[model samples]
Target: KDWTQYVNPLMGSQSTFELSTGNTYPAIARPWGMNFWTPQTGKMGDGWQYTYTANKIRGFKQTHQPSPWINDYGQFSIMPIVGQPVFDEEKRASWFAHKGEVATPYYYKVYLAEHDIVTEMTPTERAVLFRFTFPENDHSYVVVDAFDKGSYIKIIPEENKIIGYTTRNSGGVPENFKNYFIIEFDKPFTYKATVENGNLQENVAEQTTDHAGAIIGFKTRKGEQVNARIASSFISFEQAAANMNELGKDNIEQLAQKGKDAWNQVLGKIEVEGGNLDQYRTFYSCLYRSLLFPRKFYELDANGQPIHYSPYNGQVLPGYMFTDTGFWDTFRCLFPLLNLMYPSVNKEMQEGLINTYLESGFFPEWASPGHRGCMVGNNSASILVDAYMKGVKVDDIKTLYEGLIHGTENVHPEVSSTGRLGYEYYNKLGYVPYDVKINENAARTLEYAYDDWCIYRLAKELKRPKKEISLFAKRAMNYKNLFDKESKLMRGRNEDGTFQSPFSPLKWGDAFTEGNSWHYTWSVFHDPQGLIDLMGGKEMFVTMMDSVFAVPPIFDDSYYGQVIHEIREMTVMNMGNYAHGNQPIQHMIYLYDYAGQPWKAQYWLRQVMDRMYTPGPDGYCGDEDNGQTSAWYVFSALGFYPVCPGTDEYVMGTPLFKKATLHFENGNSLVIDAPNNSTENFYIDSMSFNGADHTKNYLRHEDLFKGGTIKVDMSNRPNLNRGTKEEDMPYSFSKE
Candidate 1:
């Protein structure tokens, strides 16, 4: 039941020079907790702060970064030292060993060989319990720095406490945002100093820098240990201290145990058997990563109600808040999984995201503190509709529906994070015209259509007005306008409604996001039948699906006017055009079942799980992109995939484990039994539910919630006709 042993925190901490290996930084924190502390072993950059290749440990960072591409906010790093303290990263750091280190969800520990100090960290929801044991003389010190410019640090030797704040920005956040903190030390310190030039200056009460840091000192004899507990806030220092009092009272070891209990409560939810150790580790590791984002953003007031500082306009608003996430990747899988295994947490995230909409007028496509304006979509619509349709409704469906409408209808020149590109054109022409000069024109149209469909579903449930639902439903089919029957792909249209000039399917960033035409062509997952008819019919759709993985794997760089790393990933990974390294191509593998060749879905899904992923330093072939990359594996390994997130149906695939028990918070469970499963046995020979023959290509979210039992018989050969019946196909807005 202790699944923590299977997690390798060091996974994806390394990369090749050209592209991301994982961009996954290992941090110690509670699930979706306020903060995570990681070893700052590398230089100062986004995801670059924690590379495994670093020869020295600079400091331990208190980081709230969503993705490497989004950077971080309200952050700093701390280093424990002896003798005179050096302020800069290179001189202030020490050498350490990978084997002598322990990195887990709840805790972290490492030995500094140069300083002979052992550093350990334990976390709660909003605070950290830090332990530093030294082979001491008189000069024992710990250094701290706010990550960005315009920061301040203070020392209160009278109370053995320190406090500070740093103003930081990332992507679309405002210019004057600040992150505040409070730190209390268990052991009394004799001196405090400000860092000047390179070293510390004694007798300084406070230090301020456009970019700032400081050193706190204590006189200790041999083998003495010190403990520091810290809490942080985006609201204010007083709020930060309140956050500390909420959960920071426990001692270091007790705090570590509390963290352990918290992680096990969530990590132990999914039950697995009959898989190799490597498979179990890989599976659970991905699951752990999946729940770490859209972190808890609101803090509890004295009354124990959720509230957060609105970064939009410098106001403290009453509601749940969450950030450090991008929906373009997560909407495909993450929230859907939470809808089953962790519904209560899912409800909070839904409420938090709705709060994001209320505070900022537009739902965040990518958010860190405020909107970083990363990704492209009204896709949070999927998260909202997916949750509501599955019976886990948020407080305000009407306002949430407004936010999705905002994303699809509004447009601005440079701040195009969530809204549609060429919005008025989309309303007028039904598809974005290429003459608008928007990059990824066709991709935008397809995403907008799906988002519009989500809004329609939401409206129908709310029953606001018949016209609202009808209008959105009509707009939802806008994706078909961009479909080019001539090319047998969804192509970009000119203002005059002609396809874009000199088209090549291998070109990247022209009419697609992070992918070429081959991948973007399948972006219409909401209505697979519409896509199937456009591709001719079921037989032809099957042919297109097969060729998706069988393409030459070549790409053109001319679209972006240079080579993009995503293009390189699609090329070098060598799975034809199936770029598991990215998100858009992820659901393509499961489309085979809808095309009436369920075995192809089984066979290819196995290939992707076995070949594209592993448990090594470069464990992931691409950027984990928060958790979408990992969530793909988690759902697939469980014998299904949410090919369409806005829909409640989970498209089925062959189970990877011999048995997987989904334990629900509702006090019921679903057991997946796959006897005779092995590396060679990749296909499901037959499946049954409660001992009756099951002949469906998908399972409903409704069935999983009111749990039951499932048995699957798998072998080396495919069942072939098991899920081929017309009625067995998953949801598709279709016409035969």
Candidate 2:
């Protein structure tokens, strides 16, 4: 299904004309999740904004911070430009208008009207290619701005390079972010630059300054193509130099072709059939959006030895692990989806985790390449558990187990809140009782319960009876504490054993992170039966679940207050109940599988995927949260979702694709056949395995590994009693 037609990358980039205009697109890339290049104007940050009026393209600097985050990277080297000389800021804006722009899977191109120049960008494994086209003009020139106003710039004429140094002036502190660059021209040109207060006649072999404001210029003849190659490394200048030398003269077209090939390989893994163009477009576009970040960070040398400077530890080590994951959110859906589609990548990620544990002697809290320490819960354990349960052969089980236990034992108290001492209380009291000082009781209770369940499941697999039963029983208690019998909602309780006062399910806010009680009410993914029990058995559970969709919106303008930009009513759809824009309620739709209503699960799963995700800029209602939200759609659209990551079973839903294939790392593929699948024909009439009637709604990990076709018969009308037998129910370790 070629679903790219529905994709519009420019949507949702503009919140206000001043804050973001012609800059960000939500569907294109997230705010701080991936790469962003924009023309600076003086609206959002200090004087360091990307302005269209600048004399030259100030050199494209790739930073970890996306737009809408605080400003950084004002002074960095690696600026590539070619064509007619335009050194005046205002003149550059007028002369060099944005003539055109095009972006493919792996490359981007933009033409500037000033120089009649076209700039093309493509990336290698660790480098990028910049191809510039210059129109016939005699005064063609490219100036390397090593020192914009905020930083110092030094141009080395001999090496044809410029090094930049800028102090981080925002976020209320002074930190230094240094940038280095190496420039290359298609044809050698005369080198001339105006030094600090010097005539435009000085030849700078190597210019350096540490002043409040400085700028450098590189003068070239007309029609000369300038390619400024830049590579960033936190480790050493040697690696950066190596990166530049290795990537020198790499063809942009080749890189673009490789990127497109990579996307094709991944997208082709799950071939779908029989969908309208819009449906396929939305499906594939969402799938494309799902593969953006948490980038591969292991810098292996020629022999494949690990890079020295561990991102997890600021010191040199044998291995490396990248951070930049909000594990508390992603562990639920993203990792599982990766496991299904690209198991090898998932295994490597787990291996990276083991490497992090070996280097730091502790697993990371919230890692990118660097551990910034964000979010709550020891959810990394859930990822490890998921990998292990899915038969991912992580190198060292004993060490992995030790790391998991250590993480479960000593994750940050602020993030963990309860820690080991609190787990005991949860076991004893069935929930973390709200403390007057502890503000997020409801969220903490639910997350800890899920984490406890993951750890318990792992313990059981390793045959550690004591820890297994202890944590398992303790895990069930997470629901007990929040389950209010009177209200039939997972209401937040105060320290005094009373429900949080003035509670309204319709309201959405900090009562839960970006969600209200309605979203959190059914978040017990670890124990959905218990959740169903809390709703007074399956019959009532189904009724309450049905009401969630039909409920009216709850409006409270006062709740928004002054943070109008951060808050929105669109997120609180369904009479203010079904907050699909958030995460806690994401798995709630799958709860229908546990309630003997698999058809309803199938229905709502499709609804949520179709409604919440689009191919436009504002495709997602909330943050993709490092693919956790997007992974939900990816896996759910395929007809199976990891209801619980640590478990080997997937809860079945209506598959969006008529025929979906999951290519495994072990040289096999899981092909699902549903030829007549459509928006109206969502029900599974019956399923057959090989040649026998397979009544089960769910298939086991072993079944998939053994490799055989599982054909599902679809009909416009659902046969409610067809696969509802107890034997058809998914197997559970706790069922006995």
Candidate 3:
């Protein structure tokens, strides 16, 4: 089936600085392609480059933007002008409407109203083919803006070619970073000019300055089609030309078909049936978003081996490399999803993880082509351990293990997000003390403990020294150190072994990352039972979890001095304090199964799926965060989620579709059937695997790929007794 037909690339593009509905742009590229293209609505250097509310098109840009917050790097733009070519980005903008635009994973088409032109594009891994239909004009021109911050451009009008390089990025690159790009036009340039630092040089062919661009004019007949092929490389200008030829003999139409075929093959991995048109669209849309990130940073050479410009040391190194991913967000679900359905792709990514360590001497946490100090937590441990547990092959687990150890002991000197912050305090006191200078101390402590559990598991698998394994095993329990018995929540502990005074679970961002204790208390992903016991067992745990959504969405933004977008998103959702907009609280609903209350998980999972996601401009409840939020929807819709990534279990939730097929990378498939499922039928009445009663509340990783049918009976009412036994519960560190 052509699953790509259901994907809406613009589903989550409607976003703003104040509130976000995914905070995403229409990333038109093949799945995990090195270069992605997006229509530029906002001006250059604006992180929100393609907002749905924007009324103007600045240009069509080759972008490497991950998040609006992280911004873009190695970017340049192309715009078609009908009259005299305009060099100013703001002045040359064109009007576009949704009705006159088509956005898909592989292709994009937009009508430039001001210029009376139609532009279309299709993508390869590192290249793009653009077709522009222009009205009758003697001054038709294609403008190439290589962006600001040190650029060089050359126009070879004799060959209808332009080659350029730009050093434009929002940090996280070595001093020698440059993106070499080439543009090949199917038509000749009758008029040519270049711009250096905003000054137009009439009839000039090249410019080497801080800001540079080129304008190539052509005489076009009515509805004349002009095609442009563009590709880029980090290695050299010659390599950029090589990248341009990677699409070899393929025209724009052929490339578009190939792009569609690529998307279908990946999207069809989980073929679903029995949903409304909107539901089906939403499911595939989320799946499309899920497959877009941690993009390939390496490019192929003449012999077709992976080689990359190392963002760490500015050296051209050999091996696979992936970037534009923040492990703090993706380690929870995105990587786990890849480890499951796309292990072959993940195998290369795992090798990339090792290469990152080999080049940078530490695992990357928020890597946008390099180490970035964005979010907190040393969660590279989780990403690596999850992939390893799921059988994603890596060439050097020993080196990865050594890197994990180094991360535990030392913080990244420049990028705090990469390694454990306040590692000495955490190692000595079993917690990052709130009284110390460290911020988000409790959040770091809880996450570090979970990461330690990951390390422990990896060490155990490798037959490491018993003492070393024991040390990590003990460190994994450090989450208990921050537990506040008085409030029954995780609190920041002082150096004196006292809880922070006047602590409020309503408080945001003092000891938590974009959330309060109400949410961060569940950061112990490795052991829900340990947390359950701390909160006075199952009933109390349920009550506390209930209170999360029961309480009004009031918050103390005193720590941040004002309510940020994340806090506002939680407030506006009307779901009380449960901030699904952020990553910390995303896994909490699934923990109900660990407390033997699978019905609650089912009820809330459906609520989140139905309310928090859709196939519209306002499609998501929060920032997609490099596919983690999207991966959450993908996992839940398929009836489960990796509540704990390092574990081999996916805690069961409400499966949204009546029938879904999961075609694993191992050439086997698992079918999930819920024939009576609908919006009303959100509860699992009963479940069986291959005609036998399936009592467990979770699915094992090993069993899923063996290929069988999972029959789930759905009803409007909750099946309160089903999957409520102690033995039916999912994995918990305390239980083991």
Candidate 4:
């Protein structure tokens, strides 16, 4: 399948007018591959390294950047320069024509106009090939850097290799963490430098200093080319070399083709037809972004079992692992997409995630290499419950349940270790107390309550005592305790059981993370009927939902002083207070289905898809934030969404394609065919599943797994009668 042809790697790589507008980078990597080899457009920090709008190429940086706020670790850049070499990236950078550059899932090529040198790159999971074309010059050189200060480079002349290590710490990575690497060159070159007090040094056996780096200065004819094969490991230099076995057997072209073929295996699984060209491109590009993380942090042994170097403990461990993600964001679409398209992967990822809890005392919230404790709540619990409900079982359920129980009960020195923060407050008061020092307390309380719901479900499924399930399950409705009846939204509550006064829905970050009350109030995805009961009834719930999408973009920045990027993004969007840029507001549209108004859900989702996403460098409205936003698009375009991930059902909406074929792991397939599907046909007049009528507003996991056909009859106007019955609404704990 040529599905990769529809992918544009740079879809969200351009920055807009905000500090966090779609902070995405184009990397030539296999799905969830350990390495991301992308062009470094600027010096590191705040996602400046790979902005698509930049005209110059600083170098091709190998990165593990999960999100801009989390940054990267074990990263370095490789640059090919003509004539004299310079360590400063700005000075050595060359302007490259965008039209002349080749950027794809498996390949990248850019002509360095200043040096008249052409650089090309391809990858094979652990190793990458950087092939450089040099014009007629004596000083044609290649430079590699630790990309930071105090990192050294070692030259192994006899072996035509360069072995070195660099140090950069982020998330839960230890201070002593280092990423060791080995680079083998196909063309021989001398170690050249001007080694005076203020000079460059040549053939300096080992250059170890603050800005420690070395260059291979070589001679080349006008058309001569050289290739460098590079690999790295958190374990050892020898291990990194051993990981490059695939690269040793394959050339640049072969490796490039292999990557493309590998991507097709995943991308080709969800085949679409009858959509326009740009629509097809947007769909696949978003699909491409969804599969990039949580990255594989472990390597395989001779027996083909996985073993990993623990970034937390700084020692080798005997099990599989994955990192460079936070469940706060990825728990939504990324994990669900894995379940839908790649159950085999979800099975292992569920195991890898459980291993995090086993190896460390706490489950990881956000991690680069290890626990960085970056986000709120133990959302990994949601993934655990969701995966288990969908049948990605692990043997250590008792151990995993203990970990989840510990998170809600105990506080940890490292916040990422457990999913809970302000644990004592939440445990005692059913909410995080509003205080001067505390931020996002209400949001944390709501999320923790939902995660408890996940814990309770998993416990029940594991056949633990009913009393144990009741303990955690009862805590799930704790979100309602924070909801203010008069305000009809979640408000911060004090330790004395009083509501925090002077509340405004549009204030950013007083009791929310990256959003206001209008956004965080809906963090109660685990139980919508509970929320509906709190809202008085379905009519009131529908009205409140409408007002959420109808409210103004007005906000007061007294909470954070000046306007944060999240506020700026929400305000700029015309969709009232419903900010599609962030995750808290992601499932807001699907709430309409629960309110018995499926057509409204269809209307808003289509608008979100049309306005918020596109096929350009600045396509996304805000941070792709490690596959969550992309996952949102992939699911919505396919006519359904896992609005609440821990549940067994997916909320239905309009399908973007006339037909979308899901090539299941089993021989059977699930086909979603919308024959009259079009931009104007936003409403589902009727629907049939496998030839029989499907009157429900959602599809259960068990029903979907049977692999059948879903045919929807579409129209532009709302079908007010459709899904209006009480039985048609999406699942809720109250319904049970």
Q: Which runs of model 3 end up more than 4 angstroms from their true locations?
A: none
What is candidate 1's local distance difference test score? 0.81
Q: Flag the better candidate by TM-score, 3 or 4.
A: 3
The TM-score obtained by model 2 is 0.84
Which of the two, 2 or 4, has more TM-score? 4
Report the number of the highest-lDDT candidate.
3
Candidate with maximal TM-score: 3
Error of 2 at 656 (Å): 1.8
Taking the tens digit of each residue's C-alpha lDDT, what string does model 1 give over 380-433? 778888888887888776677677767777763455766565778888989888
lDDT scores of the candidates, listed in order: 0.81, 0.58, 0.91, 0.82
Write the residue-wise lDDT of candidate 4 on 143-180 in tens digits: 77765545667877788778777775555676668788
Using all chains and alpha carbons, the TM-scores for the candidates as numbered come to: 0.97, 0.84, 0.99, 0.97
Alpha-carbon shift of residue 494 in model 4 (angstroms): 0.9
**lDDT tens readout by residue for model 3, 318-428:** 999999998889998999999998888888888888999999989899988899889788899998999888888588877888998999998888888878889999999
Tell me how far the alpha carbon of residue 93 in candidate 2 is from the true structure, in angstroms, after superposition.
5.4
Q: In candidate 4, how many clashes are counted?
A: 12
